[PDB]
Design a protein around this nucleic acid. Structure first.
Ligand code: K
Lengths: 120, 120
DNA sequence: GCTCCGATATTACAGTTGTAATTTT
DNA sequence: CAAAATTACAACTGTAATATCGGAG
């Protein structure tokens, strides 16, 4: 009946899951621990949560649960970014891009690259 | 050690206060209720919370409170977006921009608008 | 005086999230 | 010191309800 969301800490599990396509909590724990610095009890909880929310699902490979995504990366990211831009920016997308630009956040080469992603 | 956040509902009040520069709780309530439909008991609560977190301050005008922001809009939105993009996009800004191009579809007008902003 | 009102303050209560520890299998 | 499920628990959020203070009468 209710829709759920991916929390900020949950984005890390998701990203890792997407990277590995198919992975135990352990596989995921090792990786996250190279980046961020969290307890395996923590990472395991986040996993559980994503699972109860139905963002991820699992199969038992030889006794151990493997986790995989049930939502497509680009779709949910966009969905998310679209939602973020709307709460923060009254000007929408262009406004965001303008904000990043006036904060010299983009290098000459970067502006180059974006003009190519556009020039499609 | 405490740093506070602006919550999702709160970005509504914050934007109104930045537009109006100077507003009473009632000003703000009247404005929000045009767009979104929230109780004033809610809006007042969020103004209070934003006040207690130190994002907005107030001086009294004929016994009525006038709220104003203490944080520079462009900095805070930028800092916020920098945070969001990094948690969601392993590829950062350009990854996000690409994501919209491959998902969203808008005219050569919009594509130009951006190109005009990038170009500067 | 105290009386009623709108502005402001205090309080409520559950769902989400960060950050885990304890229990079961 | 397993892996997985259960429980913990305060802070932060959404979403208000209720209580009270300072003036217009
Ligand atoms: K950069």
């Amino acid at each position: 009946n209710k829709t759920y969301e991916i929390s900020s800490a949950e984005w890390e599990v998701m990203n890792i899951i997407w990277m590995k396509k198919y992975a135990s909590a352990n596989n995921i724990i090792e990786e996250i621990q190279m980046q961020k610095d969290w307890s395996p009890k923590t990472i395991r909880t986040l996993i559980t949560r994503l699972y109860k929310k139905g963002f991820i699902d699992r199969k038992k490979d030889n006794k151990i649960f493997q986790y995989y995504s049930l939502v497509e990366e680009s779709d949910i990211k966009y969905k998310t970014s679209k939602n973020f831009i709307n709460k923060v920016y009254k000007g929408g997308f262009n406004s965001l891009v303008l904000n990043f630009v006036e904060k010299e956040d983009l290098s000459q080469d970067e502006i180059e690259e974006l003009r190519n992603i556009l020039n499609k």
